[PDB]
């Protein structure tokens, strides 16, 4: 390791491979001195972490493959239901963070593993597959009447996707200002899905800590998209999920911005109601 | 220019005041060297004798130890750790 | 429904205490016209009421308290504790007599006394709703509540908490000690920060939280409090540690009138004694450079030599002596618990030996309160030279420049808006007209003004959204440079970011770094080599950079932008040539790094002729469909860059004297600048005639003004030059006298722009040649 | 147009004309009995003159037939104080508000 | 399409390669040169 | 003191300029436990960055270079400035060589590092099998030397045209000599250990 100064090379063929900012691979017959690699291996602890992404993709193209199969055609390939169902709540104990009693010492060494190791997985799929899948899947609104292009076992477990989908959504955006900041381009889906009557506990903590990591994302918001959420105070009863998001939406770094500020006293403010 | 630049009695008293303290550091607390970090420090040491708990100089430098270790690029350039390196230095 | 009903329920009081958190969101940030709107929702006596009642719970006691104080009195706190550590008196003749002991070696009691620090009201104005609506409002400030009614209610509460904890009441005021003594402690330290109270009524808080030294039951100090209750208390000691800071500068700010006041006399005493002392002939100038060659902040450390070239007599040497020994005991060192020098320094490893801390502040705060009481002589050293004195008539017009400057660090912390872009500029314009803004310009060092208007600058640059305000925060600037000098080098080294985000309309941030190379040759021959290629490289850019704002208008295609690199220039021949002479490093370092970049230069020199351009250049200004079809014009900025251009090559030469002597290199800048340009390129510029105007005149961005003709003249003077005649008579052949005859036609602004160049120029053309 | 109906018989002597300072002390609730605003609150009379174009037009011409010792009931319409939208926080758009009125002092 | 990058590309998941040979029997010994192996994508999982 | 240096990563600050004058404090006398204290807390947390740290940290220091020199040289005899001023010398500094003290303090914490004979520190200080990066220091210092010997050589042959020298050039050269005074010695307790 180190000393090697080795190249990969062929067997049959017998001729070596280089390059002629992103350099493509060729098979180059001339060939020259800048071949002499070093061999590095990096850290053992996320391979089988790349591995799981692996597996559970090769899941997920099979789950892309099954379900819009009976999407476009109504029905008066066996669905994994069992498969898909446990997948998930491990992932949720995989990137849930650690309790608040442990020392500085060996809590903040894990933060920053799970960071970049949440980073390390943004860049293969991760956090547009969610949407992927869930794009087609709330646009049924009923548990067992609209759900029933599938069959019983998903009439049955209509509930138990989405109430960990929107928990792994959440998880991402835990505490993580890296990776919210390219949800901000389409921050109308976040906003029109509250009084949809089905998992509304994940979809207002994702809007908590979509708010908290970047205020990138805060100079969007204007009067169209803040009024569903006074409408979801009124339709979900007396949440403490539902006034904090506003404690945190207009504060910021310590600024704030006043295009924000009084557009709530517009509203909920002055009805008393 | 400096021929028959003005002399003192020419520019006002409210001029003269300013001019006075900005040389007055210069010459009077400039030139004071003592040695009070000595006696500051064997108190926090000292304290240990009470009537296995942390001491109080040991909470300040557990304190500095894991001020640094933050995640950041750049390190926090603070108020008192300037000063108080010289003070134990 | 009783609020006196949520102690049980479980439910709905952790709902009600986070309705009031966003209460305090909506009113914070200096945020003004929802603070009257809220007063109508929550009004005085429902808060009055409710803060002296008892039976109340811990998390809504705590959140309607810090409410009260975010609605009404955080927008009166900043303006105060961001300048408490500048320290400006004037001398009134209420600072003529204070000791620094009260007079009856004890040491006085803190936070009283007379102080006289120019500080600016709150300016507090009274909440109405019958009010008819205007319409934009121009400036909406904080409801009037009546204080002194509350300045007993802010005490009393205390007063019997403390003979309850004494007491020690199991189920106390809230649920538990921590709600007893958290809120109260902070609603007393803002009020104690901003100066309501008075100097006897804060008698009785030194008699609260210490009854035993204080004195002119039990206290607060020692009894055992958890760890989140008493920062407060760190905090309003380091209140009143910071006021015992402030006695020290006013008692010695009433000594720099005292001492210039005894010695100002004695000095006319001097110089009317040695005036007629002619006994002395070698000596009498040596004592005379006492008098006359010295700076005036040169002779007051001449002065002070006295220690272990003093002409000064024996009897007006030992008031300081006593002064400042004085000022040493009133310090740690007694200079050969009783005081709050040994009360407090006693109580933080007090607190330490009890428990381990469980907080980040806490550590750090009462840490850094004792290192400032044991070395208040070196803390006094780094806050007394940012502390100035001006004379008592100036009052009415530096307390509205300390309004402003409380304005404008109010605004700093919001983003900027819609209507926020003429609040700021009329506040930086209402400096302007101050009368103090040009009469000392080193107080405004010490309040940090020169950088808070480049932070707010920092914000908008990082496209820009904000076009108004650029222009006027270099406004500012502009007219800062240049009122002195030492604030010059405040601005040299934020140059790597005063010309980053130059490459608009008006003026843009390179002005300032022009303006910051000005006037001296010391602040000119300072600056590292580093700073420059990045000019040549925006240079560089625009030798084949289009221009975004021609062809987004319109405008025929020029492959090159001539006015977007034209004042680039200007920055450069500033930073080389100061005041009549010439650099000896930078000039030799310009040339260089100037002539390896083959853009950087026009597209005629790249391989046609000077002249073939300008041949080109005045036909298409002539005609409209090859010019612009509303300033900005091809037609005079292809002339324009070339001006430019040539000129700093004509003054980027060295001095004469340097060319007879042994300088290996300072001729081959010569020669090579005489090589790559031509001589006989320059008689045809010289030899174009005018457009005069007769009877018409013609439009001055549209054609030949002499602008551009003063800059061939000085490139013919020096680095090229004259030695014999044949060429002497052939300059001023065509050069000078069909035009300077076109002078005498009408001897009208163009006949002054070229009077402007026939006595600025072709004179010391001819003077230096007339032997 | 505003009806006036009055609480407690005061004077009937003195009605303010132009050039006369006032304190009346108010106090207010809407339509839908919610409390908005007072000056009980205050311990504070609340003093103005009348012409300054100071209170809302609503207003002003009924503080201008009332007399000392007198508490009257005014109900204003929308369309006589902040028809369109109004002020932000206060009152919501096209409301009735609701004063009783008392004149304390000072003609 | 395969390509080489800088050093921020140089941390993520799918720019590691393993090494495994053709026989199944004590396949993970020290090797020398000269031995055929074969290059393993991980996250994709498609090998080059 | 270690890892608010080891967090810093490429700042020449004025902080360090204090941290290091404490490291100066508490490895002067030539002690063993705290040899001992720092070796093991090193190899056992693994976290290479502290190397980095001191293998940015000494090459951005300043040099005997003679462009930067002139222009001062006429700057210094300006005395008198005009619109009743002096001149700021101490504002000013000296342009060339103004990081003296952090490479002086610097170079005797490495002394003192390894002042103590104890040679598993020697052969830590170029070797680390234990971490996955060497850094190798005492090529780089020597880096640093053949840097300053052709400094301070083309500063010779710039004035031995010049017989009699006068003082700020030769001040320049003895604030240059007092820290070549101690990275002269600053790798010889690199090798006199056994």
Redesign the interface.
Known sequence: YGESLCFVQHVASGLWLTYALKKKAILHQEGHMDDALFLTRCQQEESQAARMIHSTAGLYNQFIKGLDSFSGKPRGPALPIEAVILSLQDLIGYFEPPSEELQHEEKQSKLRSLRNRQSLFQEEGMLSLVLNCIDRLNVYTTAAHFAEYAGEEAAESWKEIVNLLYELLASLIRGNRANCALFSTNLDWVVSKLDRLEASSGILEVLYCVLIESPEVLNIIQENHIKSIISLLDKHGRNHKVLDVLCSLCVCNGVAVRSNQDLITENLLPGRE | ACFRMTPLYNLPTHRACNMFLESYKAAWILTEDHSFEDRMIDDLSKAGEQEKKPDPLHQLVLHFSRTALTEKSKLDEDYLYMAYADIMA | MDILELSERLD?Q??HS??L??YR??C??G?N??AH??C??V????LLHALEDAHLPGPLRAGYYDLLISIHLESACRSRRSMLSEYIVP?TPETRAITLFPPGRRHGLPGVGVTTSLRPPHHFSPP??????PAEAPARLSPAI?LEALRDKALRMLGEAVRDGGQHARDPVGGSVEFQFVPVLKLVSTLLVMGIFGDEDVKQILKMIEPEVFTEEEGLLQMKLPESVKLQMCNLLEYFCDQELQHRVES??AF??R???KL?AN??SR?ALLMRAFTMSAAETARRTR???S???????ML?HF?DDCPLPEDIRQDLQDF?QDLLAHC??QLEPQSLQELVSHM??RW??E???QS?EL??AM??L??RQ??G?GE??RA??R?????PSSVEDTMSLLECLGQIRSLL???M??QEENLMIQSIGNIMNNKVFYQHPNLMRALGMHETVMEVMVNVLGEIRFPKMVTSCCRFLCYFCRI???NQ?SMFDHLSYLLENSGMQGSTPLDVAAASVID?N?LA??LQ?QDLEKVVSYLAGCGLQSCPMLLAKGYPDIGWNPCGGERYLDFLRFAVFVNGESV??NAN?VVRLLIRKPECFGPALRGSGLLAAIEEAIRISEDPARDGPNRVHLGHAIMSFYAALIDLLGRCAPEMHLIQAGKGEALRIRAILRSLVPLDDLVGIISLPLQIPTLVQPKMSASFVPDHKASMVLFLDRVYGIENQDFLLHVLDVGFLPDMRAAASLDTEMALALNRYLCLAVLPLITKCAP | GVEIETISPGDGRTFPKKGQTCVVHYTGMLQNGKKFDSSRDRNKPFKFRIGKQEVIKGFEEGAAQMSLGQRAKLTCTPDVAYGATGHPGVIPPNATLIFDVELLNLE | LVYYEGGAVCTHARSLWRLEPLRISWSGSHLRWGQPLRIRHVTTGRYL | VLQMISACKGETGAMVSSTLKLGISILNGGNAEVQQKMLDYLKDKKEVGFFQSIQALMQTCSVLDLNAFERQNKAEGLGMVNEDGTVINRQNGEKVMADDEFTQDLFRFLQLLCEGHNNDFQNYLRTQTGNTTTINIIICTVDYLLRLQESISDFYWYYSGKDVIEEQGKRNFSKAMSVAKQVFNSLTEYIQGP
């Open positions: 709905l952790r709902f986070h309705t958190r966003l969101a909506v914070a940030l945020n016209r929802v709107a809220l109508s929702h009004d005085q006596a429902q001398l109405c709703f019958v009010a008819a609506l009546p010695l700010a720099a009138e001492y210039v006041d100002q000095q006319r110089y008098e006359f060659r700076p005036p902040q040169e002779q007051i450390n002070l220690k400042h740690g060192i933080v490893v330490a030996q428990d381990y801390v980040p550590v750090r840490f850094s004792l290192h044991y070395d002589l006094l050293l007394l030279p502390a100035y004195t001006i004379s912390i919001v983003q808006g819609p002195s000098r030492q080098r001296n010391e021959l300072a080599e000896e490093e370092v």
